[PDB]
Amino acid sequence: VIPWQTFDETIKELSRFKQEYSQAASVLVGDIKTLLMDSQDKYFEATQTVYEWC
Amino acid sequence: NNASGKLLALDSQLTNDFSEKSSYFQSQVDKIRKEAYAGAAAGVVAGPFGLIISYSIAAGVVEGKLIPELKNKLKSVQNFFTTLSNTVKQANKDIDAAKLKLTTEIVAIGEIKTETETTRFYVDYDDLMLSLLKEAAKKMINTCNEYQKRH
């Protein structure tokens, strides 16, 4: 008379969607952060080399 | 640079999973109340005595011991989340301060290497009494003494 198992299955499905996409997005944003810091290190090295030559 | 990305990838997962536990709490408290006030309705096998002595046990035990203990556990989870967020926020400041400390010293060493290379090229005129090489050496002496005063 009270459908509790379908309620639990719906809650677990709508939670599993969000868990999956948080786990998928966090690693990719953390990789973009590393790339953006390595680019700044290469930029600093190149501009400092040209400045020291000039 | 790798740890400075792993730290952000941990922080975002933390801030999402805290909310997905805070919703699980409210979805589970209602399940406890459903099971308690549904099992307590089987006190109709006795008279009116057997009904009140079941609803009194249910609405005493569940509403006085099981719900505030879960609220205290949720409060402990909140305090843990705040502490770990402050730890991540401090680690970012440490990494950024270390990187700035290294790049400032790279620039300060380049300011010496420029004058050293200039004096090395001024030597190649094969004229030791050239006033320009004398002025370059007098500039390098002041630069080296001002570097040694800093360390």
Residue numbers in the entry:
A (entry chain A): 34 to 87
B (entry chain B): 142 to 292
Task: Give passages from the manuscript.
Soluble ClyA monomer was previously found to assemble into a 13-meric pore complex in the presence of DDM, but a dodecamer was observed in the crystal structure. Two top view images (or bottom view, as they cannot be differentiated) clearly indicated the presence of both dodecamer and tridecamer. Based on the particle numbers of total particles and those used in final 3D reconstructions, the majority of the complexes were 12-meric, representing approximately 80% of all particles, while only 11% were 13-meric. These observations confirm the existence of 13-metric ClyA pore complexes, albeit at a low concentration in this preparation. Final 3D reconstruction resulted in EM density maps of the dodecamer, the tridecamer and the tetradecamer at the resolution of 2.8 Å, 3.2 Å and 4.3 Å, respectively. The near-atomic resolution maps of the dodecamer and the tridecamer allowed reasonable model building with accurate side chain assignments. The inner diameters near the extracellular edge of the pore are 70, 72 and 77 Å for the dodecamer, the tridecamer, and the tetradecamer, respectively. Comparison between Prot_12 and a protomer from the tridecamer (Prot_13) or the tetradecamer (Prot_14) shows that the overall fold of the protomer does not change when forming various oligomers, indicating a rigid body protomer assembly mechanism for the ClyA pore complexes. The interaction paradigm remains highly conserved in the tridecamer, suggesting a single protomer-protomer interaction mode in the ClyA pore complexes. The protomer-protomer interaction paradigm in the dodecamer applies also to the tridecamer, and probably the tetradecamer.
E. coli cytolysin A (ClyA), also known as hemolysin (HlyE) or silent hemolysin A (SheA), belongs to the α-PFT class. ClyA is a 34 kDa soluble monomer, containing mainly α-helices with only one β-tongue that transforms into α-helical elements in the pore complexes. Each protomer in the ClyA pore complexes is composed of five α-helices, namely αA1, αB, αC, αF, and αG. Here we report the cryo-EM structures of ClyA pore complexes in the presence of n-Dodecyl-β-D-Maltoside (DDM) as dodecamer, tridecamer, and tetradecamer at the resolution of 2.8 Å, 3.2 Å and 4.3 Å, respectively.
